[PDB]
Amino acid sequence: AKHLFTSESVSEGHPDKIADQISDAVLDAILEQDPKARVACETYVKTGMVLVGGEITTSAWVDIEEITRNTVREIGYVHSDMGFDANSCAVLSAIGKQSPDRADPLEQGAGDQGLMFGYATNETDVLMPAPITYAHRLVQRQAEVRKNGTLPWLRPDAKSQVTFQYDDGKIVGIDAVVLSTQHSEEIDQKSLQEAVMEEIIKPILPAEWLTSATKFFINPTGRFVIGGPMGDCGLTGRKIIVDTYGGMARHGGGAFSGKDPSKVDRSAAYAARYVAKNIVAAGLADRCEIQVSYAIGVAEPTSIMVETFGTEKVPSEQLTLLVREFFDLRPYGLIQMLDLLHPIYKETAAYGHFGREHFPWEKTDKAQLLRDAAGLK
Amino acid sequence: AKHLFTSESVSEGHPDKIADQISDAVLDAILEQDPKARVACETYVKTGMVLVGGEITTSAWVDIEEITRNTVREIGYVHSDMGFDANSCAVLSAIGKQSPDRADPLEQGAGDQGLMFGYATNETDVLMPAPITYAHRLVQRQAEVRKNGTLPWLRPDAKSQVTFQYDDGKIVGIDAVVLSTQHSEEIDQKSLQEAVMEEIIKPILPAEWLTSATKFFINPTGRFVIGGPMGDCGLTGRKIIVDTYGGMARHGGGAFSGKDPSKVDRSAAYAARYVAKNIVAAGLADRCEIQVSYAIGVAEPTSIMVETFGTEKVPSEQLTLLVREFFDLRPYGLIQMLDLLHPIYKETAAYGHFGREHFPWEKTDKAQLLRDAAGLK
Numbered sequence: 001a002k003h004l005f006t007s008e009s010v011s012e013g014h015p016d017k018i019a020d021q022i023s024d025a026v027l028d029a030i031l032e033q034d035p036k037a038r039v040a041c042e043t044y045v046k047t048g049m050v051l052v053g054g055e056i057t058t059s060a061w062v063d064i065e066e067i068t069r070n071t072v073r074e075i076g077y078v079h080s081d082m083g084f085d086a087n088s089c090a091v092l093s094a095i096g097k098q099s100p101d102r103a104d105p106l107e108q109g110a111g112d113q114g115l116m117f118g119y120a121t122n123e124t125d126v127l128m129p130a131p132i133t134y135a136h137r138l139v140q141r142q143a144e145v146r147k148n149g150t151l152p153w154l155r156p157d158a159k160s161q162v163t164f165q166y167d168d169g170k171i172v173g174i175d176a177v178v179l180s181t182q183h184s185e186e187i188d189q190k191s192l193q194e195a196v197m198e199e200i201i202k203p204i205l206p207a208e209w210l211t212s213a214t215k216f217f218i219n220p221t222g223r224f225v226i227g228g229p230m231g232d233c234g235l236t237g238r239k240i241i242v243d244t245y246g247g248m249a250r251h252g253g254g255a256f257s258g259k260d261p262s263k264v265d266r267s268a269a270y271a272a273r274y275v276a277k278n279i280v281a282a283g284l285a286d287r288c289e290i291q292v293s294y295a296i297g298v299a300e301p302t303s304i305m306v307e308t309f310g311t312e313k314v315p316s317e318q319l320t321l322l323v324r325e326f327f328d329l330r331p332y333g334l335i336q337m338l339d340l341l342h343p344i345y346k347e348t349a350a351y352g353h354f355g356r357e358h359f360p361w362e363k364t365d366k367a368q369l370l371r372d373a374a375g376l377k
Numbered sequence: 378a379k380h381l382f383t384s385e386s387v388s389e390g391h392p393d394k395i396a397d398q399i400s401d402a403v404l405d406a407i408l409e410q411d412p413k414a415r416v417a418c419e420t421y422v423k424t425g426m427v428l429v430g431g432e433i434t435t436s437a438w439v440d441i442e443e444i445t446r447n448t449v450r451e452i453g454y455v456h457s458d459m460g461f462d463a464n465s466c467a468v469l470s471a472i473g474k475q476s477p478d479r480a481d482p483l484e485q486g487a488g489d490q491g492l493m494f495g496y497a498t499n500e501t502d503v504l505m506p507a508p509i510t511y512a513h514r515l516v517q518r519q520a521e522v523r524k525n526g527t528l529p530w531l532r533p534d535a536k537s538q539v540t541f542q543y544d545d546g547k548i549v550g551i552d553a554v555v556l557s558t559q560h561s562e563e564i565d566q567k568s569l570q571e572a573v574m575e576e577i578i579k580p581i582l583p584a585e586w587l588t589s590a591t592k593f594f595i596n597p598t599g600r601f602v603i604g605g606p607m608g609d610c611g612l613t614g615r616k617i618i619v620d621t622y623g624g625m626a627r628h629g630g631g632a633f634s635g636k637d638p639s640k641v642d643r644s645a646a647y648a649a650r651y652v653a654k655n656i657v658a659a660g661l662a663d664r665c666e667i668q669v670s671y672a673i674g675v676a677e678p679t680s681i682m683v684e685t686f687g688t689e690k691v692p693s694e695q696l697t698l699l700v701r702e703f704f705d706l707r708p709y710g711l712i713q714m715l716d717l718l719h720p721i722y723k724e725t726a727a728y729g730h731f732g733r734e735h736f737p738w739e740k741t742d743k744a745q746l747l748r749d750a751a752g753l754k
């Protein structure tokens with residue numbers, strides 16, 4: 001049966017992502033010097049202004065200003081006529097520093113409560129929903145061609161949204177595509193439309209999916225010239241769905257960036273991506289969504305639900321069974337199973353935390369063991 | 378089949394909610410004077426500090442400081458030993474003001490792109506998932522008994538999380554309950570546990586659902602004495618799931634508070650709650666989730682999906698059909714259908730935007746017409 005579904009993505013340099021990247025840049029920077037630092041670092045950015053505020057608990061000494069400005073420059077906001085300059089905006093910070101003050105460390109309990117969700121589906125090479133995969137790929141492409149002089153009239157800020165029509169479970173093709181890139185005053189709009197069609201859209205989207213019918217909307221309102229923080233507000237934790245799975249699978253409250261791995265909100269979610277992906281690369285089901293939860297000071301998850309939406313090749317009790325045998329879902333266990341105490345996190349902060357294959361949670365190393373304990377098959 | 382599911386809520390005065398309430402307090406305050414003001418007003422609160430920053434476009438003159446402080450006082454943070462004082466914290470603001478500069482206004486296009494989701498299910502009197510209903514009810518109760526001198530040793534900040542076990546679709550009962558209230562240095566912990574059991578938990582949760590087996594965790598880590606902004610960070614748009622449906626139904630990126638109704642992220646989501654609830658009070662299905670999307674400058678939604686998860690009493694094409702006949706889903710249509718240009722919004726900012734019955738989107742006024750166009754039945 002037909003039905004359509006949509007998902008959105010935004011580039012590096014959309015204001016909430018500028019915030020996400022800065023936070024994580026500070027997370028990495030401390031993790032480089034002190035892999036066991038506790039950090040929670042929420043950023044806010046606004047037209048003149050980056051306020052990076054935190055509670056951090058570490059040895060490390062790190063230069064918030066310098067870190068901030070460098071990140072703003074990588075994204076490329078470097079002159080007042082863009083809307084924001086990395087070399088002259090104000091960076092205020094408000095980071096409270098705490099200097100660091102059971103038998104089996106794996107038994108330490110959850111830092112805070114929470115529910116968190118993970119998905120995979122075999123609809124993609126990366127085991128991700130197609131819409132969120134393609135939306136991310138449009139916006140990536142736009143930062144790519146910007147950065148590499150191909151299309152150098154184009155400025156950082158940009159959104160993509162792709163809407164896919166499916167008949168039963170099966171992607172039929174692409175009903176609409178929308179892309180809106182900040183660009184210089186130099187280029188004008190029909191010429192831009194050809195360019196993004198040539199260079200961002202046609203080389204990313206599968207042709208078989210595009211038809212005579214695909215409604216494309218490229219800068220629909222025209223002249224997107226000042227963007228980024230100018231006239232807008234980024235805060236960490238706002239593009240929370242884009243981070244995940246574009247609205248295909250569910251979400252607990254929680255944001256990732258600027259939280260170190262002791263934070264279940266990040267880790268437990270990475271681990272759930274990891275269990276669900278392994279469940280599917282193993283041929284245990286076609287789609288798998290999984291809810292974990294935790295309660296403060298208990299170590300075991302208060303809840304595990306698995307939902308393979310009628311797509312299992314083994315009954316489900318047996319599934320949740322081996323969910324538990326192959327995975328240490330306790331707070332310190334996650335951190336062990338995925339080897340998290342490293343400065344890996346800024347790369348996460350833009351184009352999808354998931355679907356991207358060199359992160360510890362994307363590897364399908366438990367594939368076979370899951371298969372051949374799922375009976376033997 | 379058994380499986381469990383969890384949802385979380387937080388009180389007024391959890392820091393992200395303090396932010397949510399302040400933003401919305403400014404939204405209402407302008408809407409009182411200028412119902413057509415465009416406002417987007419993101420707040421950030423941190424130990425000394427409320428930064429309320431915005432882009433606003435209105436006639437209205439309003440006192441951000443005074444508004445902020447009053448809201449902080451209603452929640453009750455009123456003395457340094459709580460962690461935050463409404464009468465002496467600093468309120469900085471950064472609001473850019475713009476003074477206001479097609480044939481059928483209903484045809485004006487979407488302000489921005491987005492996907493948004495709505496749900497109902499007949500699992501509750503209010504047509505909401507039970508977990509998110511009960512979690513909100515625990516935290517409400519805790520603000521209630523605090524505020525009305527029953528339990529006056531208790532301070533604002535608090536979280537609840539309830540985990541429900543279901544056999545097929547049918548709530549069986551409550552596996553675990555967690556509640557963690559900030560409290561004065563006066564009361565200690567065993568005495569507090571009796572009190573919250575007597576006065577917050579036993580009078581809110583259905584008894585038939587509680588058993589011999591219900592794992593209750595009340596202040597698990599003990600002594601929650603300073604809370605609110607002290608040592609933490611609120612930002613608007615962080616308790617985004619709690620706002621919705623606790624993780625039962627899906628989410629687009631988007632936050633509500635501090636956005637006026639021209640903002641699809643709010644409105645379209647309220648309208649989706651409205652269509653889905655009417656679909657179920659009409660007996661068209663048991664659970665209905667609905668995805669709407671929009672693209673910038675188009676007026677019609679780019680996408681409508683309805684998902685009545687095998688629970689329809691009419692086939693689905695016919696459903697999406699009458700989804701379209703009974704509802705004006707265009708940006709200005711939503712605003713018409715739900716009569717939004719009023720100062721109604723601060724009440725939204727704490728305990729659930731939905732499930733709460735005197736908001737324009739909760740009324741089931743299209744009930745019958747939907748029934749008797751759904752064939753006649």
Ligand SMILES: [Co+2]
Nearest residue numbers: 016233234238
């Ligand atoms: Co935003």
Ligand SMILES: [Co+2]
Nearest residue numbers: 114253254265
């Ligand atoms: Co949280």
Ligand SMILES: [Co+2]
Nearest residue numbers: 393610611615
């Ligand atoms: Co928070």
Ligand SMILES: [Co+2]
Nearest residue numbers: 491630631642
């Ligand atoms: Co948005």
Ligand SMILES: [K+]
Nearest residue numbers: 256257258259
């Ligand atoms: K964070």
Ligand SMILES: [K+]
Nearest residue numbers: 237240614617
């Ligand atoms: K959020």
Ligand SMILES: [K+]
Nearest residue numbers: 633634635636
């Ligand atoms: K907002």
